Symmetry: C2
Subunit: 82 residues, 2 copies
């Protein structure tokens, strides 16, 4: 897994980016493979969120994470509130 400090940076980065668009990030898991790294988390959204909207958010977050954390690839599991 990635260093705890990095995980905290990633959490803070996500929190800022999801304001008004998602409710919670949880079940966050990481692993390193040399020059590359992996992140997986559940992204909680309002139940009424359109699937397209959730998908677009995930795509944006993946791109943003890749830029801010070189080598990092994210997998995101969208979850409705409750």
């Amino acid at each position: 897994g990635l260093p705890p400090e990095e995980v905290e940076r990633i959490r803070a980065f996500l929190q800022e980016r999801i304001r008004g668009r998602a409710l919670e990030v949880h079940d966050l898991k990481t692993r390193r493979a040399g020059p590359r790294s992996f992140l997986e988390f559940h992204l909680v959204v309002r139940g009424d969120t359109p699937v397209e909207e959730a998908h677009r958010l995930c795509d944006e977050l993946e791109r943003a994470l890749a830029q801010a954390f070189p080598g990092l690839q994210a997998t995101i599991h969208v979850e409705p509130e409750g």
Copy 2:
């Protein structure tokens, strides 16, 4: 994989069960493990489908598949049209 006639019955079953609730199923992958079997597929929904509704449909399809094909367990990837 499962016997070819069975895979087609699974496909046709899904296509019926999603009438009025999703658009398409694709990329069906199957495996047998003794008396158990596994299915993975992609479920295409309208972009405006609420995330709660997509989640509920996946749970329903999983239950329906387990009843119609004893021992079969499904994993479903939701995706918006286009």
